[PDB]
Amino acid sequence: RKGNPISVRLGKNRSSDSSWFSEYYYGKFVYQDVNLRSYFGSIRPPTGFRLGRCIILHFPKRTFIHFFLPRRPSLFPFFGATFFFLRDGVGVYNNLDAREQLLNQLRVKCWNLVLIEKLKNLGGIEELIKVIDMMIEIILRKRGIPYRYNSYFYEVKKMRSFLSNRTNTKTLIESVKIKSVYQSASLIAQDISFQLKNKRRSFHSIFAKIVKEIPKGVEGIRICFSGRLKDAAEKAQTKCYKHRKTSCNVFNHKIDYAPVEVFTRYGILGVKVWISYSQKK
RNA sequence: GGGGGGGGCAAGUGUUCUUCGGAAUGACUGGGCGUAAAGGGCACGUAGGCGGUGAAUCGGGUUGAAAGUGAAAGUCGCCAAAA
RNA sequence: UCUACGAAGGAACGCCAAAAGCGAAGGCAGCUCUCUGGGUCCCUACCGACGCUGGGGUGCGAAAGCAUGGGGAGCGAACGGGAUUAGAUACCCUGGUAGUCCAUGCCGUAAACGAUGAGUGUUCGCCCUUGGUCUACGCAGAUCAGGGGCUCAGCUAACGCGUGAACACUCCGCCUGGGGAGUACGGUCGCAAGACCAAAACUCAAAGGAAUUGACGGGGGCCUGCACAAGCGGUGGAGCAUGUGGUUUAAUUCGAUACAACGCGCAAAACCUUACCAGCCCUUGACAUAUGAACAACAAAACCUAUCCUUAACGGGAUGGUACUCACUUUCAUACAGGUGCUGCAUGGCUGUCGUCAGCUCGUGUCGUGAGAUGUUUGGUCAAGUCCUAUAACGAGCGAAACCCUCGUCUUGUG
RNA sequence: ACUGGAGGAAGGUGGGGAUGACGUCAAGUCCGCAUGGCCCUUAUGGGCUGGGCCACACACGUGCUACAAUGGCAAUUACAAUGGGAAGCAAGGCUGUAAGGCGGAGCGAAUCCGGAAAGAUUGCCUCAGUUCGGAUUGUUCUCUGCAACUCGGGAACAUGAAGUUGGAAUCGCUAGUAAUCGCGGAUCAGCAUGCCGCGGUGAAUAUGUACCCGGGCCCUGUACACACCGCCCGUCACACCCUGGGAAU
């Protein structure tokens, strides 16, 4: 009785997130999918600050990953000619330019050290060049302590290290700014599960913010709560709000649903969100 | 119930007793009695209450005026001293 | 029994007939006659304000009851049996006296109920209708007394009345929470039964009226489901397998409990699974962070591929070898880790459930002082609040349908 | 809208699934997971073996087997579908009465693997407690595992409980369904009378709302609102309290 809207719509509406196939490894691909969905959540979400849908793809030694982030509040066996053709186009910290600036002012910021140990050393050195390039390169790798490079989030490099090391495959991680924030359902759930965490907030104010900002062509929003409500602390009960088009017995209706559970030390409260998308726009 | 904190009053506070008000909750001012408590089983009739007109008279009630009295203290208005 | 005629009696009065009529009220009817109360109509004559109500008082006052004397058909308390039931003083049957009836007396009470004191004046109408009166010219129009509906307004907490429960009036009786209680005491009246005046102690925060929703009903009023009906086969009897109810120790682990638990978690108990029971031990623990007193290694130690030995097993004891980290997991010590420990009457999630039932509702509008009513209350259709029709609602959401897949027929395309 | 009729392979939701409102029942489970609160912190914690979860005077539930001759058995022959297979499915040959054993063509699987059972042909039976019926019930054995006395299947052969349609009741079903026929997975070394799926064969009956039953409507009545398994009256037994009559005073 009363299924959710996932198990019906995979036939027509939705494409399941991943896309691949195995015969012997399926048993170790369903897990490399589920645990990684567990990951991408609980990654500096304090507040919201960070969310996601994370459509993934697996190829034979290639793995595509595409997050979805809202706004912050010759010889042919040179196959490099088609690999970096596609594993490059980010622009996330195209360190070419800031590295260029560091290259420019590097001469000064090092040559001014290299004259109590500059001229004396030049005397002893041009008396006694590659081995001098050794007492030269000692200071290039001194700047582990002071360092002025940057990145919006090179955490992409960070994870393309972690997982490619522990899985042994060529990987690609991108993030795309989902502009119209939380038109999805997992996003809305992740959101209101933050305001319900400290400090406390109003249900009616949450729904007022919702009807304030979100109704931009979304067909309807049906939202339920549950838990030890405010505030008799006994007899946990339910309440739910509705809107124009709130249907699930009708097919061909992308209506995404993902509950969540956050607490108040008085037991736990849990919300559910059943949005409905205007189809055929 | 205990710790802390705060409100109300203040050389006074709180409980009980005591009487009025709220209490139109005995209703003259200020009610009800069909279904809510309350119209008698019904009438008769005694006092008793109350109850047509116009004309006349009297002046008991009625009413207008004066004095006596309605102790002083009290209530109250003012005034002044008193703190 | 019946069937025709008779006789005896008693008792009530069929139809008319009547929300009709008469009475002050209780009441009153087969008929005829004597006597007799009150009434209304009527030119109107007189008469003259003599009226209205009415404390204590006075009569009347159904039924049952009492007294004395009649009568006793039928009915029928009490009682008898047939019954009926777990039981039956009952309801059901058959008997059946007192009683019903008449004569006179006694009580003096009834839901004596329009549950509405009595009287006077003023009030929009319509419909009637009992009996009077005036006027009649196709026929009624008018006017009085009443009896009965329906209404304008007015009032009412609500229903409702409107011959008032309206607008006002005078008089009478009474009420002041429920219970205790119309009880005790007491005074009168009665042959008795009893009647009439009639409290309080004590006790509670309620007792209650009308109306709304909802449920309910061995009540109507439809309509429907292997529910029943037409069926066909099964558990219940025997033997086994499984599960639970039980009782048995050391355990017979635990949760499930009408449809909606019990071949259920279980999609799989040798040990393991396993919480349960005994031995066997461990306790910063198998596991996690920080924790530095530590120990020192710039490679020790540990630690681990393999050999040996003991432990019912865990281990453990070696014993090589491999193997290294300036971090040692390596050490004890800590803060702790942990608990299939308790709690679903704290919860989330999940599920069963009514039920694939067709019913749930919302927004404005109205109506209701209000709770709430309307939309979904009409005639039909549907498997459906599916639909049309009607409509003070107009609409929307949820639900249903169709969307989905599948099979079935066929079309094409890769083969 | 209904009734037919047409075509059509399908006629009026063609059949099946899927999909399951408000909400109700403090329904279920803190023993899956998560979680509040409360307790133990050499213990209710961790691990090891043993032993227990499998018993039994006992009732109840679900499933299986049949009492037969529409049949039990032996030899002949006919027809599936799903599916499953690398801790794997394994043809053939050889070996064992057989269960088992030796080894292996192919197959990670439209290609390799898999005697369908009913049914049908003949014969035996000839109506028995039986050649129907098989629990209990002996010896040999064997599969796994390190390990089969309490505590997994499997084969040989002998024994052969009750059972002759099973009370009252009560349950399941309206056409590929009932009933039976097997076949195939599932968890898993060892395993199904259980569960999930697949196909063989295959009807009874449609009187329809009279009835009991169940549900809805709406129309009435209610003292019910924990909503009839509701409220609720009265005697008696019980405690405390108050009060009346009452001889005599």
Side-chain angles (χ1 to χ4, degrees), chain A residues 210-270:
Chain A
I210 288 304
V211 303
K212 207 162 188 161
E213 58 86 18
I214 208 64
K216 60 183 61 63
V218 288
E219 213 62 308
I221 311 90
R222 182 184 174 277
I223 178 181
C224 276
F225 311 77
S226 285
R228 285 171 66 190
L229 317 180
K230 329 300 157 295
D231 203 26
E234 299 290 330
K235 183 60 77 182
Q237 285 302 131
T238 46
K239 78 171 69 176
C240 304
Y241 313 125
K242 299 177 40 57
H243 261 171
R244 293 182 183 174
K245 200 41 75 190
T246 74
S247 197
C248 311
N249 59 355
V250 185
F251 305 145
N252 65 14
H253 279 58
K254 213 179 176 187
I255 53 174
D256 301 349
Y257 156 74
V260 76
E261 309 154 320
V262 282
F263 62 93
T264 179
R265 196 268 307 275
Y266 296 120
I268 70 173
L269 169 142

Side-chain angles (χ1 to χ4, degrees), chain A residues 17-18 33-41 53-56:
Chain A
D17 51 19
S18 308
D33 273 320
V34 171
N35 63 352
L36 285 195
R37 304 299 182 188
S38 161
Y39 195 74
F40 314 140
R53 302 193 195 174
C54 176
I55 317 184
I56 193 173

Side-chain angles (χ1 to χ4, degrees), chain A residues 4-114 123-124 129-281:
Chain A
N4 76 350
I6 300 172
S7 316
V8 185
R9 268 54 176 265
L10 289 179
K12 304 173 299 302
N13 274 316
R14 180 177 304 207
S15 65
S16 40
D17 51 19
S18 308
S19 313
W20 45 260
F21 174 96
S22 167
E23 272 152 350
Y24 179 31
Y25 301 79
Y26 200 80
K28 199 251 182 184
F29 279 6
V30 70
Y31 196 77
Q32 292 278 61
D33 273 320
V34 171
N35 63 352
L36 285 195
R37 304 299 182 188
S38 161
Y39 195 74
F40 314 140
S42 70
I43 179 64
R44 329 173 176 164
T47 297
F49 276 168
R50 175 168 169 71
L51 306 93
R53 302 193 195 174
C54 176
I55 317 184
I56 193 173
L57 290 146
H58 266 284
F59 296 169
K61 313 279 171 179
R62 291 164 84 177
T63 76
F64 281 166
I65 286 174
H66 312 317
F67 291 77
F68 272 97
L69 266 50
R71 66 100 187 183
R72 275 173 156 170
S74 90
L75 309 185
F76 268 114
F78 198 95
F79 57 94
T82 197
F83 270 16
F84 261 101
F85 177 61
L86 306 163
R87 52 169 161 167
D88 166 68
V90 290
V92 176
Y93 180 50
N94 59 327
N95 46 8
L96 305 179
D97 198 299
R99 189 222 58 175
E100 175 75 16
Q101 279 190 319
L102 187 133
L103 192 87
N104 259 346
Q105 291 97 39
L106 205 45
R107 298 293 177 183
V108 178
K109 200 197 177 182
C110 316
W111 267 100
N112 290 39
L113 197 85
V114 162
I129 298 289
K130 293 179 179 179
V131 70
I132 290 311
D133 216 345
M134 285 307 302
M135 193 56 245
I136 282 163
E137 282 290 330
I138 293 172
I139 309 311
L140 281 77
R141 273 178 82 191
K142 168 62 185 181
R143 290 159 184 247
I145 324 299
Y147 65 108
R148 302 149 176 256
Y149 81 97
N150 316 93
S151 159
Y152 195 58
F153 64 117
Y154 77 110
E155 301 297 327
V156 288
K157 316 254 205 313
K158 285 309 288 168
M159 45 196 163
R160 255 173 306 118
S161 73
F162 312 147
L163 64 81
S164 187
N165 168 25
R166 269 293 198 73
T167 62
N168 212 354
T169 173
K170 275 175 181 170
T171 179
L172 310 92
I173 296 148
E174 292 197 354
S175 298
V176 194
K177 41 197 170 194
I178 178 58
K179 305 95 173 178
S180 311
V181 54
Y182 40 67
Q183 71 208 23
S184 160
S186 189
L187 318 176
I188 302 275
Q190 184 82 339
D191 165 57
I192 74 185
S193 42
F194 281 148
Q195 302 186 95
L196 292 181
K197 201 163 269 189
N198 61 352
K199 279 176 186 167
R200 76 196 189 286
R201 269 213 48 179
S202 155
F203 296 86
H204 60 264
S205 73
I206 289 170
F207 189 81
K209 206 193 99 75
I210 288 304
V211 303
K212 207 162 188 161
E213 58 86 18
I214 208 64
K216 60 183 61 63
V218 288
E219 213 62 308
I221 311 90
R222 182 184 174 277
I223 178 181
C224 276
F225 311 77
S226 285
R228 285 171 66 190
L229 317 180
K230 329 300 157 295
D231 203 26
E234 299 290 330
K235 183 60 77 182
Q237 285 302 131
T238 46
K239 78 171 69 176
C240 304
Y241 313 125
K242 299 177 40 57
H243 261 171
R244 293 182 183 174
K245 200 41 75 190
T246 74
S247 197
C248 311
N249 59 355
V250 185
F251 305 145
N252 65 14
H253 279 58
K254 213 179 176 187
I255 53 174
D256 301 349
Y257 156 74
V260 76
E261 309 154 320
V262 282
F263 62 93
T264 179
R265 196 268 307 275
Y266 296 120
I268 70 173
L269 169 142
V271 315
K272 316 181 177 49
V273 305
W274 309 20
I275 45 179
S276 167
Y277 285 59
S278 68
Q279 282 280 103
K280 197 265 168 188
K281 65 180 70 65

